Symmetry: C2
Subunit: 377 residues, 2 copies
C-alpha cells in the first residue's frame, strides 16, 4: 500500500476549544500501533452528543480534539496483531467497544465493555497512552474512541464493526449511534411487546427511531411528544398515532399523557437529554407496570428526581447506551436488516453535504432543521 | 348461627385520636352488606404501618378508627351475593384487594387492584360508603380495608383470601403484609437469579424476609446493611453472608458496597423507607444490569434522586407493593408454601401477647424490641 506504515496528512475538523466553531484544516494521522486500525471515513453524520461536547457540557471534554462518532468507512491498514479485519474491509467505528471476554461483554443484558473505556474516555490510545493526531507536532485528542470528523482516523480493534461490504456507506453510517440507540431502546432495553402503548419524548432522529421500532414491535398506540410541531408529519410517517405539543396544554405533560391513556403508557422513552422531561416520561409510564427508558444525554451533574411512590406503585426507570447493542457482534446484524429492506433508515437523512460545510451542519442541528446530515469528503 | 344477620358486640381497640393510647372496649359490628364478609379474628399482629397512622403522620388518617391489618381468622357470615367464601372458612383479610376483573388484576406484573381502594382509603365500605363499626351509635372508621384490632370485622369480599384450614392462624397472620412483601420483592419484582449477589438495606421483618428469599433463590452473597449492628446476628440467621454498618466507614455506603463487589450487587433492596438510602441502594446496584427495588414507604415530602448516568449505564430502579402478590390468588399459595416446611415464617414471631396488652405491644414495637408481636383474644 502507498500509505501503510506512514503518517497521513488529511482533512479534518478540529475543536481547538469549547463553544467555538470547528476549524476544517489539515491534520497528521499516525500509523496504527498494536491492536489498532486506521480507517478511511467515507461518510459521517452529526449527533447531538457531538454538539453537547462542543458546547462545553462534557465533564471529560478534552481539547483540542476531533469530534464525530457516527461514520462508516474502509480499513486502510491495521497494526500489529490485528486479525478481525484487514485492508479493504468495510467497517463502522463503534464508540461502545466489544471484546467478548469481560464481564459486560459476556452478560446477555449489557453492552458496556471495559476493554478500552479507560483510554477512549481520555481521548488517547491504550497501547501507549497517546493520541494519533498531530498539528505541527502537537497532540490532538480523540473523541469517544472514534473521532470520525477526519478523512482518516485510528481506533482500537475492539471498536471496529466489520459490515456487509455491499452496504452503502453514506446510509449505514447512521447505525454508528443515533438510529441504533433508538431501535435498541425498544428491542433490547424496554423489549416492547405486541399490542402495547408507547410515548416518545423528542422527535429528532433518536425519537423517530424509537417510533419506527415500536411500530415494528407491534405497538398499538404511539404518542409522539415535542414542543416543535413541525416534527409531527414525519413522526406520523414513521408510525405515530398521536402527536402532542406540551405548549398546547396547561397541565404538566405527564398529566396530559396519563389523561389520554387513563393510567399512562406501557412504555415511555426520553430522547432529549432534559432531566425535567425524564421525570415527566417516568410519571406517565403506566401505573403498575410501566417502563420508562432514558435514551438522551443530560448535562453532567444534573439530577433526575421523582417520588418513590411512583416506583412502589409499579413503574420502572431505566436507561440505555447505544441501544444495548453489543457493537461488533450486532452492528453487522443491523446492516443485514437494512440490506433486507426491512427498515426506514434511508428516511432519516435530510441533508447530504460536503465535509467543508460541517459548521453549517451544526447550525442545522441546533435549529432542529434536520434529522441527520451526512457529510462526505 | 346465633349471630348471622345481627349486630355483634365484641372487644376491640379504638384509636379515638392520634398520639393517644388505644382504648380496649366493646364495639358494635354491623352485619355484612352486599359483597361483604364478617370475619372472626383469631390472631392479629402489629406493624410499623399501624403505628405510623396512630402517631398522626398519615395524610389519610381518619379518627376515630380501628387499626390493624395483619390477621387471620374464620368467616362468621357473608353478605348478599358472596359465594367465594362461606361461614367456617379460614381466611386472611388483605389490605391489597384482588377482583380479577380490573386492568391491574388482569396484568401479569401488577397486583394493584382498584376495585375497593377508594373506599378503604377513606375507612368505609364500597356498598354504601359507610363504616360498619359504632360506639353508642357513633361511627368508627375502618383502616386499610381490614381493621383487624377487633374480635369481629367486616371486609370487602375482594380482600378475603381463603386459606388451608390446617394452617395455624397465629403464624400465617403475617402473610398479609411485611413478610410477604419482602419475599415478593425477591421472587416477583426483582426475580433474583441463582448465583447472584444481593444487598439489603434495613433489617426489620421486611429486610429479613428479603434476605430469607434471596437465600432461597440461590444468591451467592447477601450483604445486610444497617446502622444498628445488634440486628446483625439475626440477619445472619436468616441467611446474610456479610453485615455492614455504614457508620463504620468514612466513604458513602454505596462506594463501600461497590468496592466489596467490584461493580455493585446484581440486586439491591431498600427496606426502611429512607430516600437517601434508596439512592444509595440504586448506586451500588451492578453496573450494566443491576436492579434496585424500593420496598419501604418514604415520608410525606421526600423525593428520590440520582444522576441519569446511573440508569444509562445499566441500573434499573423499581419498587414493590405487597411483594407483587395478587392477594386472593397467591396468599393461599404462600400458606401452602409455609405448610410445606420451606420457610422461616415462624422465626418472625418474637412475642405472643393477649389483646388486652395491645398498648404494651405498641411500646415494644416503638422500642425496637421485637420483629413481630402476635395478639390473641
Ligand atoms: Cl358501585
Ligand atoms: Zn451519538
Ligand atoms: Zn468487553
Ligand atoms: Zn404490616
Ligand atoms: Zn382488580
Amino acid at each position: 500500500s502507498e500509505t501503510a506504515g506512514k503518517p497521513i496528512e488529511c482533512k479534518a475538523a478540529i475543536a481547538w476549544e469549547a463553544k467555538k466553531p470547528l476549524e476544517v484544516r489539515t491534520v497528521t494521522v499516525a500509523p496504527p500501533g498494536p491492536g489498532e486500525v486506521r480507517v478511511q471515513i467515507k461518510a459521517t453524520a452529526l449527533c447531538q452528543t457531538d454538539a453537547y461536547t462542543l458546547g462545553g457540557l462534557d465533564p471529560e471534554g478534552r481539547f483540542p480534539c476531533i469530534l464525530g462518532h457516527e461514520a462508516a468507512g474502509v480499513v486502510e491498514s491495521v497494526g500489529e496483531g490485528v486479525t478481525s479485519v484487514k485492508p479493504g474491509d468495510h467497517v463502522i467505528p463503534c464508540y461502545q467497544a466489544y471484546c467478548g471476554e469481560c464481564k459486560f461483554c459476556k452478560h446477555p443484558e449489557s453492552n458496556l465493555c471495559v476493554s478500552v473505556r479507560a483510554f477512549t474516555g481520555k481521548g488517547v490510545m491504550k497501547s501507549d497512552g497517546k493520541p494519533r493526531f498531530t498539528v505541527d507536532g502537537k497532540p490532538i485528542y480523540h473523541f469517544m474512541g472514534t473521532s470520525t470528523f477526519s478523512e482518516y482516523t485510528v481506533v482500537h480493534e475492539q471498536s471496529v464493526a466489520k459490515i456487509d461490504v455491499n452496504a452503502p456507506l453514506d446510509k449505514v453510517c447512521l447505525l454508528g449511534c443515533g438510529v441504533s440507540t433508538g431501535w435498541g431502546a425498544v428491542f433490547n432495553t424496554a423489549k416492547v411487546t405486541a399490542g402495547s402503548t408507547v410515548a416518545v419524548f423528542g422527535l429528532g432522529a433518536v425519537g423517530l427511531a424509537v417510533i419506527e421500532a415500536a411500530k415494528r414491535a407491534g405497538a398499538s398506540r404511539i404518542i409522539a411528544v415535542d414542543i416543535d410541531p413541525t416534527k409531527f408529519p414525519t413522526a406520523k410517517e414513521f408510525g405515530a398515532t398521536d402527536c402532542i405539543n406540551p405548549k398546547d396544554h396547561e397541565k404538566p405533560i405527564q398529566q396530559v399523557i396519563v389523561e389520554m391513556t387513563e393510567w399512562g403508557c406501557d412504555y415511555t422513552f426520553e430522547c432529549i437529554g432534559n432531566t425535567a422531561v425524564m421525570r415527566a416520561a417516568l410519571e406517565c409510564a403506566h401505573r403498575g407496570w410501566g417502563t420508562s427508558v432514558i435514551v438522551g444525554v443530560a448535562a453532567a451533574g444534573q439530577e433526575i428526581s421523582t417520588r418513590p411512590f411512583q416506583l412502589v406503585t409499579g413503574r420502572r426507570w431505566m436507561g440505555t447506551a447505544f441501544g444495548g447493542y453489543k457493537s461488533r457482534v450486532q452492528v453487522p446484524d443491523l446492516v443485514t436488516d437494512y440490506m433486507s429492506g426491512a427498515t426506514l433508515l434511508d428516511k432519516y437523512i435530510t441533508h447530504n453535504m460536503k465535509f467543508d460545510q460541517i459548521n453549517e451542519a451544526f447550525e442545522l442541528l441546533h435549529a432542529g432543521e434536520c434529522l441527520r446530515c451526512v457529510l462526505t469528503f
